[PDB]
Amino acid sequence: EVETFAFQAEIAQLMSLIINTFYSNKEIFLRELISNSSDALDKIRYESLTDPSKLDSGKELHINLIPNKQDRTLTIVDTGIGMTKADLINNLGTIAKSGTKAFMEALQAGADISMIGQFGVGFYSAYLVAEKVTVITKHNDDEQYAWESSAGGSFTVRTDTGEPMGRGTKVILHLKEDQTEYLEERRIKEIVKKHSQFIGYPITLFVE
């Protein structure tokens, strides 16, 4: 079973600006995703302080960067708090309607696209480099869900068959044809060091 939803008008607009604006500094997508992972990891660490049982679905709090040159996907996995079905539908837990409006007004007054994360909508920077994004997520209070979108104004949500992840969020970037540099090991390392060097959780870059 697959449900299909329209993005709110404001998120459709944000997505179109990211996809259609000429902007060469596309590499900032990664620190935005890493920063999202870090926030979700913070959240599970804090909840676990009063209820250790929240970590029964995995004690290790970390981030994995997984390139696959065959599928042309870059995957950012964390073992953070994950998301419920309702959070996913509700702009992946972001304040995207108000965040987008504030971001637009900022762009009018001298901001640029790399400041997107300052408005709580950094997730959508994914579309700087990816033609399609799949988000798989598992919250302690819910089943595993798969969100997906190639933009165009719509996204799907379904229950995720098979591969149970325990707890956390997985962002699979199906990369644009001309953005394959972000599957190269030295490129990913360079970007982590440039933008995400000092982070509260370990980051493992998988090799192929």
Output the known binding site for ATP.
Answer: 36, 78, 97, 123
| Helices 185-195 and 28-50, packing angle to 10 deg | 70
CA distance 138 to 83: 6
The site partner of 201 among ligand CT5, a copy of itself, none (C-beta below 5 to 8 Å per kind) is a copy of itself
In whole angstroms, how close is the CB of 140 to a copy of itself at the nearest point?
17
Residue span 155-174 as binding mask against ligand CT5, x where in contact by CB under 6 A, dash where not: --------------x-x---
198 binds a copy of itself (CB under 8 A): yes
Our CB check for ligand CT5 shows the closer of 101 and 108 to be 101
Q: Which does 90 bind (CB under 5 to 8 A by kind): a copy of itself, ligand CT5, none?
A: a copy of itself
Distance in angstroms (rounded) separating the CA atoms of residues 195 and 121: 17
Q: Is 49 in the site for a copy of itself (CB under 8 A)?
A: yes
Q: Which of 102, 105, 138 is nearest to 120 (CA)?
A: 102
- Of 179 and 186, the one with the shorter C-beta distance to ligand CT5 is 179
Number of residues counted as binding ligand CT5 (CB under 6 A): 19
Q: Please give the Cα distance from 52 to 46 (Å, whole number).
A: 10
78 contact, one of a copy of itself, ligand CT5, none, CB 5-8 Å limit per kind = ligand CT5
Query: Which residue in the set 93, 125, 144, 188 belongs to the binding site for ligand CT5 (CB under 6 A)?
Result: 93
Those residues whose C-beta lies under 8 Å from the C-beta of residue 41, and which sit 6 or more positions away, are 61, 62, 63, 78, 79, 80, 81, 200, 201
**Residue 15 and residue 7 in contact, taking contact as beta carbons nearer than 8 Å:** yes
